[PDB]
Design a protein around this ligand. Sequence first.
Ligand SMILES: Cc1cc2nc3c(=O)[nH]c(=O)nc-3n(C[C@H](O)[C@H](O)[C@H](O)COP(=O)(O)O)c2cc1C
Ligand SMILES: Cc1cc2nc3c(=O)[nH]c(=O)nc-3n(C[C@H](O)[C@H](O)[C@H](O)COP(=O)(O)O)c2cc1C
Ligand SMILES: Cc1cc2nc3c(=O)[nH]c(=O)nc-3n(C[C@H](O)[C@H](O)[C@H](O)COP(=O)(O)O)c2cc1C
Ligand SMILES: Cc1cc2nc3c(=O)[nH]c(=O)nc-3n(C[C@H](O)[C@H](O)[C@H](O)COP(=O)(O)O)c2cc1C
Ligand SMILES: Cc1cc2nc3c(=O)[nH]c(=O)nc-3n(C[C@H](O)[C@H](O)[C@H](O)COP(=O)(O)O)c2cc1C
Ligand SMILES: Cc1cc2nc3c(=O)[nH]c(=O)nc-3n(C[C@H](O)[C@H](O)[C@H](O)COP(=O)(O)O)c2cc1C
Ligand SMILES: Cc1cc2nc3c(=O)[nH]c(=O)nc-3n(C[C@H](O)[C@H](O)[C@H](O)COP(=O)(O)O)c2cc1C
Ligand SMILES: Cc1cc2nc3c(=O)[nH]c(=O)nc-3n(C[C@H](O)[C@H](O)[C@H](O)COP(=O)(O)O)c2cc1C
Ligand SMILES: Cc1cc2nc3c(=O)[nH]c(=O)nc-3n(C[C@H](O)[C@H](O)[C@H](O)COP(=O)(O)O)c2cc1C
Lengths: 174, 174, 174, 174, 174, 174, 174, 174, 174, 5, 5, 5, 5, 5, 5, 5, 5, 5
Amino acid sequence: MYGKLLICATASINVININHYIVELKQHFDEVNILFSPSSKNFINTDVLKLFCDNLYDEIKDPLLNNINIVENHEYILVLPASANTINKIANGICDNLLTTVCLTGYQKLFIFPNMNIRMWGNPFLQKNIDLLKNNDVKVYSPDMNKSFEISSGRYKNNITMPNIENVLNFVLN
Amino acid sequence: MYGKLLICATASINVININHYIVELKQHFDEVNILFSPSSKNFINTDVLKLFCDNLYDEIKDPLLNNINIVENHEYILVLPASANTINKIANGICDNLLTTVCLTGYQKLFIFPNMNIRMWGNPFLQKNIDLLKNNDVKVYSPDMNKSFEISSGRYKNNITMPNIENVLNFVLN
Amino acid sequence: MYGKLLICATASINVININHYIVELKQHFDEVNILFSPSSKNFINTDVLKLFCDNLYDEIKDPLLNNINIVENHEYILVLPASANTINKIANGICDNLLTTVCLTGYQKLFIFPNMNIRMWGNPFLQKNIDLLKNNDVKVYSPDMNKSFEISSGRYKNNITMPNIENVLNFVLN
Amino acid sequence: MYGKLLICATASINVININHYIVELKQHFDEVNILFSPSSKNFINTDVLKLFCDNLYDEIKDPLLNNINIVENHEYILVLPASANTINKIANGICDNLLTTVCLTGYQKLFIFPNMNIRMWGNPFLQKNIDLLKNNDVKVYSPDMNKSFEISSGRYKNNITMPNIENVLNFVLN
Amino acid sequence: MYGKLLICATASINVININHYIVELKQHFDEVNILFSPSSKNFINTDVLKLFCDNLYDEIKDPLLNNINIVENHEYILVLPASANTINKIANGICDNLLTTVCLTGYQKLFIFPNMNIRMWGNPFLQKNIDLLKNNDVKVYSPDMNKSFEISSGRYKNNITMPNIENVLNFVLN
Amino acid sequence: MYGKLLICATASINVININHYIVELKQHFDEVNILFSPSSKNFINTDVLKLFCDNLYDEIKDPLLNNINIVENHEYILVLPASANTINKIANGICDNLLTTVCLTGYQKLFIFPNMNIRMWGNPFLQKNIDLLKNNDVKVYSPDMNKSFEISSGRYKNNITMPNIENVLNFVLN
Amino acid sequence: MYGKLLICATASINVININHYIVELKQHFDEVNILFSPSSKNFINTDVLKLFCDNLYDEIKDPLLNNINIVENHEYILVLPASANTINKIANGICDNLLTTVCLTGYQKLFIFPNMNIRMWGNPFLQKNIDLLKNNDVKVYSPDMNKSFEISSGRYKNNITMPNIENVLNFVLN
Amino acid sequence: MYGKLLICATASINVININHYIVELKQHFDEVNILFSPSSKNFINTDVLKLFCDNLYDEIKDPLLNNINIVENHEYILVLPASANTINKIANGICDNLLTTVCLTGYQKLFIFPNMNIRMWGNPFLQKNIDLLKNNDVKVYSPDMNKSFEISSGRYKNNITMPNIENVLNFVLN
Amino acid sequence: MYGKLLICATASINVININHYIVELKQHFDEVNILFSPSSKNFINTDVLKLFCDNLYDEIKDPLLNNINIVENHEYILVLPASANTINKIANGICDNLLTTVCLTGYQKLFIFPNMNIRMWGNPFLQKNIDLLKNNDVKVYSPDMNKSFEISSGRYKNNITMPNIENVLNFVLN
Amino acid sequence: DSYTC
Amino acid sequence: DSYTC
Amino acid sequence: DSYTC
Amino acid sequence: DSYTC
Amino acid sequence: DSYTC
Amino acid sequence: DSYTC
Amino acid sequence: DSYTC
Amino acid sequence: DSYTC
Amino acid sequence: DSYTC
Ligand SMILES: Cc1cc2nc3c(=O)[nH]c(=O)nc-3n(C[C@H](O)[C@H](O)[C@H](O)COP(=O)(O)O)c2cc1C
Ligand SMILES: Cc1cc2nc3c(=O)[nH]c(=O)nc-3n(C[C@H](O)[C@H](O)[C@H](O)COP(=O)(O)O)c2cc1C
Ligand SMILES: Cc1cc2nc3c(=O)[nH]c(=O)nc-3n(C[C@H](O)[C@H](O)[C@H](O)COP(=O)(O)O)c2cc1C
Ligand SMILES: Cc1cc2nc3c(=O)[nH]c(=O)nc-3n(C[C@H](O)[C@H](O)[C@H](O)COP(=O)(O)O)c2cc1C
Ligand SMILES: Cc1cc2nc3c(=O)[nH]c(=O)nc-3n(C[C@H](O)[C@H](O)[C@H](O)COP(=O)(O)O)c2cc1C
Ligand SMILES: Cc1cc2nc3c(=O)[nH]c(=O)nc-3n(C[C@H](O)[C@H](O)[C@H](O)COP(=O)(O)O)c2cc1C
Ligand SMILES: Cc1cc2nc3c(=O)[nH]c(=O)nc-3n(C[C@H](O)[C@H](O)[C@H](O)COP(=O)(O)O)c2cc1C
Ligand SMILES: Cc1cc2nc3c(=O)[nH]c(=O)nc-3n(C[C@H](O)[C@H](O)[C@H](O)COP(=O)(O)O)c2cc1C
Ligand SMILES: Cc1cc2nc3c(=O)[nH]c(=O)nc-3n(C[C@H](O)[C@H](O)[C@H](O)COP(=O)(O)O)c2cc1C
């Protein structure tokens, strides 16, 4: 059991399966808390996650949540899944919501797991920001390529896939 | 008749005349669809554009619009009028609304037509982003200078003006 | 008595004491007007400031406020308190609200007074933007260090503090 | 520069381009004010016209607007575009909204510019009312026929078209 | 004491003094009931009239009020004050609200007391309708001229005035 | 099977049985579509008619319905039941709602079936409009007299009754 | 013409005729402004008074109205009609709404015109407060007794009546 | 069976058992009606009392309830439970809600049964008002002391208790 | 460190600086909790005070807050700033909101710090209540006179001023 | 069955 | 002209 | 008193 | 049963 | 420039 | 700074 | 016609 | 199972 | 006078 861990979940289609990660990670960290981007609420009912994680930080329920306290209360902060938008906001120091504010404050404990279409992944601006993040000690995991179900065509093509737990653990703990 | 074209309209005072472009462009492209930034809705009733364009993408009516499908469905994507804000968001890979998300995903089919006060146009940060966009193969039209009706004083002075259709077509097709 | 001055107040915990600055500054500038970021409204009732400042610019009351007019109507524009978020948005030319739009348009009359936790202040991305702002003639005040009230504990500690009026005046007028 | 002019805009698809007329007319009349029919608000955001006209009369913002004052404050009152409905209401003295009430009160300064499909234009009842209006000194412009954009097909055809500014000016001033 | 009487009050500025009539008429008719036009509700709180009249017919409280029952329940129906709009609607058989529907159904017991600016009174279309009403046995009182407090300027000038009770009674009973 | 037919239903107490007509007429016309007046919605849940007619035109669901398309899409347009109000609005060319707008546009395919109390039927103004309609080629059916259930007294007195299907068909097709 | 006068109207059934006083008083005072108690809004639409008085003070439209400014801007302050409640609140220094706050601040320019049922007038506590008000230089008019319309019965009886203008003027000016 | 009785219930924790009193009193008075203070609605659903009392006076359902009629319709008016606040408002003649207005109007038929913590009961100001009430012929029952369940500590300590029915009857009838 | 202290803040313009007191007092009392009057919420966002005080009592969030518990939980209760209205309500035992209810219950631990315009301070009724409060052992601080920034005119004049912390502490502890 | 007010 | 409850 | 716009 | 805060 | 249904 | 209306 | 702030 | 647009 | 999180 390691220290308290915070999941910063963003609006990736894969956020709908964030519960699998919470349960897995709860077997290795004292606490697993979660914080969502405003847009991810269009994909899931974030309320149900209260049943799996120790604490759910909701900026609508409480608009005055202390980002400094949140950062100090955790040893690890994971952006999972990390959207292109949030990755780029973090890289530019933009923090117009609680999630990004927490990421700016806790850049030293930040672990980013990118998830998006390979086409989005190729964006020049996104890539420049990913280099900037890495060159400034923000840990950015290298997306895995594999069989992914493409909601667009319903085909199982090759594309960026979500990281399995072993890889998450190894990237965060090593 | 060329392929399907998408207009990404932003909050420039000139968005109120976007219908003139839709009608003109509809004479040259199989389809002319439109997508607005949240802020542009304070300038016009976007609903009426449904009468001129083939399809209106509304992220409020449908928060789960697939940006990948939208990008794949078009051969050309025009940011017209393109605000300083959206230009700068695109340059930094920021996509916190459907319009900018579409622009990040379809950077390869992107054509940007800047419109703003000459004073805003002189902003250092805006200009660095415009260079960055151009140096990464995003087509950015060079704003035209001419008699523009300044709303501050009901007097026609010289400033940045909207591109006429010939120039739009030539910039997009050549 | 110098020219008209505009205060661009952002979501720093210290925005709750912005009235002290308005009253002080009103003793030296013909007019002291104020403009808030959307988020700062969660800290104070901005309506009450109408009793101290000459004019309150409210983008909700009037979504079509002319940023060019606002910039032209003032000789000085102060971002006070200036949040990490707004500082970073200005540095990247991002202007998705009235306050930042005004700051992009009036970069030449801009004076920024940073306020945030020392930990946030150390963010790499924030610092690169601060250099970029300074290297492009945007005046950025160097945060003062001193005794401060820590809301989490209710006790005093050393951290970034708000600038006193003498320093504000001297930084803006000299 | 002639006296103050009032535009009474009704629910014709062409009301979306009413701004072009406001700007043009502002070059010839001391003031160009506007008043919309309730239904035209489904076509445009009338709020934006405040940026072009001197005054916007809004019966929702102020349900107690004095129609007598409005009529006395103008030398010319134009119903442009004039819908079949409003034309027929005026002809029968029906005034169940501010616009029609103003038209009944100011029949002596009224100039009507009909706009509608040629098929609607052929309605017997509409035509009897147009004769009645003309036979009672209400100036009714004769609709121009020419090439027009048909929203249903997106192609151009011959039909009633909007009057150009020269014709508007000549019909009102001569 | 004569039979039950119904007052159909319309949106004339003088509707604010309708209570004086209710009280007076209640001294001569078994019952004095009232029915307002939708627009008159912008001038007064119709609810208070429940304290003076026997019954208040509210089409919003009850959208299914039987106009036939209402007409049969009264021996006299007065349109007081009668607006130009309602007079013209009655003349054309238009009944798009409860008040006008009642007037169409009870044309045989109808007594109309016009009230409006002398300028509105001169409207050609209004006058043709007044002749049509009279030529079809609808009793239309001839407006009185006298000192009227013009709201445009706090000065008493000569204009159409409200009928005193003696005249109302005499016109209705004789 | 004849061409597409449109039913324009108005606020007559009998609109509650409009479904019987839809089903009957569907046995003789390719399509039977329906359009209601705003007031008729106080008598029935118009939504349920979607289960019987091919298409339901709802101006609230879609405020920008093309009246020209609606008229062109049908060979016959029936106002059934036709209220005194709608009959009179049509006769005067008044079209302040979708139903009346469609009737003005399609006067050449219009078939009107009046339904109201015999007392309302005797209104002078209504009758003048009915003559005007007939003298201008708008087909107006002559109301049938027979045993009708009078909701007012619960008695089966003689009054105007709804037309049976044979008469509807014969009046429309012959 | 005397100085500016303020009417503080309270929830007496007679507040519905407050317009008669405004018009009368406007013939003798530079300005006649009005301020209502929250409860009086259940008797009338206070908005319409804007058409008769120079200024309407609305604590809902503006919750931060300066009572000191209001008191300083007038030479006379009349509580008319004055309810038992407001009279008693003033006597005890209670000011939980704008009207009573203004009355506490301007006790030196206060003129109270009581209106209520004779039975309420006999209340011991009310009377002790009236003595207290008089013994502290607050001018309290002695209610007139005469014929009055009793809303419950609709017949006339002897009771407290409203003061005529001569008496109001004489009590305020002498 | 005595005359009609009115219960004026205030916001005492004991108002939740007011139904027991209604049922008991209904065995001795022709009618038992009830009227609640606005705040007592936070303790119970006042609607259910309609099932026990003859009439429920609701100032929200009807803001224009005639307090004079209410007082005249009853021989006895009981404030039960009577809160310190209502007792003090009555003593000062304050009537800013229907309940207190009724108590001011019916002071001659008023019977007050105080209920509150013994600590509140000791308040100097409350006691001065209780003397004032008694010295002006308002019947104020002397609170009973006994075993009361203290919600605060869950202990059955000695404190002021509610009056049993025998005492209520004897105090009111004797 | 003394016992728990409660601040009862009322609607004085100075309530906007109540945070300065909370922070200061927190250096001397185990706990500093706050409770606002309903009206003071128009001056500030009371929510933010949760970041400075130990507990915020909100009667809207919880309408059933036990005033007895609140009073028992504190050794000192300060009305700061104390408005004329609240002072007068306390003096008369009026408690129609949580704040005044707490003050009635805890009169024995009450410390009142008056703040208002000198003109309001001169009100006879207010002064009689202040004497009554003092003569009944309620501690009422004597307002300080000094340079106060008058909001009517941006000029520093002499008037009642807020008490500095030394005086607050000395008045409460001695 | 037809109806009438 | 005057009213009472 | 009678009124007019 | 009587109650007390 | 001109539109029709 | 202290305030007054 | 083109526009500018 | 991972997803992709 | 100054606050921090
Ligand atoms: C159905 C759907 C799925 C999406 N999937 C992704 C994704 O896998 N990765 C991504 O970066 N954005 C994805 N997007 C776009 C983001 O939701 C969008 O850029 C958003 O503004 C990001 O906001 P956030 O950073 O606050 O979560 C998707 C959008 C939708 C509607
Ligand atoms: C009346 C008015 C006109 C504006 N005109 C322009 C313009 O021409 N160009 C521009 O870049 N911004 C303009 N702005 C500022 C933008 O609306 C603002 O920066 C906005 O946040 C951009 O958002 P968007 O990128 O989502 O459209 C205008 C604002 C208003 C109120
Ligand atoms: C109680 C609290 C206090 C905060 N204090 C600060 C601060 O001093 N400085 C800062 O940069 N951000 C601070 N934040 C974070 C900002 O509010 C957040 O980054 C926000 O998105 C900035 O938005 P803005 O730039 O529109 O004002 C605080 C947040 C809360 C809830
Ligand atoms: C998309 C659309 C375009 C329309 N165009 C016209 C038009 O050009 N002329 C016209 O007379 N009516 C037109 N109509 C019908 C009118 O809007 C309708 O008769 C309306 O009730 C008129 O109201 P008004 O007189 O208050 O403006 C149109 C309706 C829609 C939905
Ligand atoms: C303050 C004001 C006063 C008015 N006075 C009159 C009047 O005296 N007579 C009249 O015919 N219309 C008057 N009007 C115009 C009518 O209110 C308007 O024509 C309305 O649509 C009539 O509707 P109704 O027939 O349903 O009452 C006035 C309007 C306002 C705002
Ligand atoms: C219960 C009831 C039944 C009605 N029956 C009829 C009827 O049979 N015929 C008619 O012309 N009006 C009837 N009316 C009156 C109309 O509904 C009313 O005149 C309405 O304004 C017409 O609007 P429309 O033409 O938009 O349907 C009735 C009203 C109600 C409340
Ligand atoms: C229809 C009706 C008429 C009233 N008439 C009077 C009156 O003439 N005088 C009075 O003192 N109270 C009267 N009242 C009672 C007051 O409205 C009530 O005491 C109210 O709380 C006073 O509030 P205010 O002082 O804010 O106006 C009346 C109440 C109603 C419902
Ligand atoms: C749970 C609770 C119980 C209360 N019990 C009493 C009580 O027994 N007696 C009392 O005088 N006030 C009591 N109070 C305080 C009153 O409700 C409060 O003073 C209120 O403003 C009185 O308003 P009213 O006179 O309109 O009922 C209680 C409050 C709460 C939340
Ligand atoms: C901008 C403004 C400032 C005020 N300042 C004061 C003040 O300093 N002292 C005071 O007693 N009342 C002041 N008032 C009046 C009170 O807000 C008012 O009497 C209120 O009803 C008191 O309510 P409370 O006792 O619930 O706080 C002010 C009002 C406003 C709108």
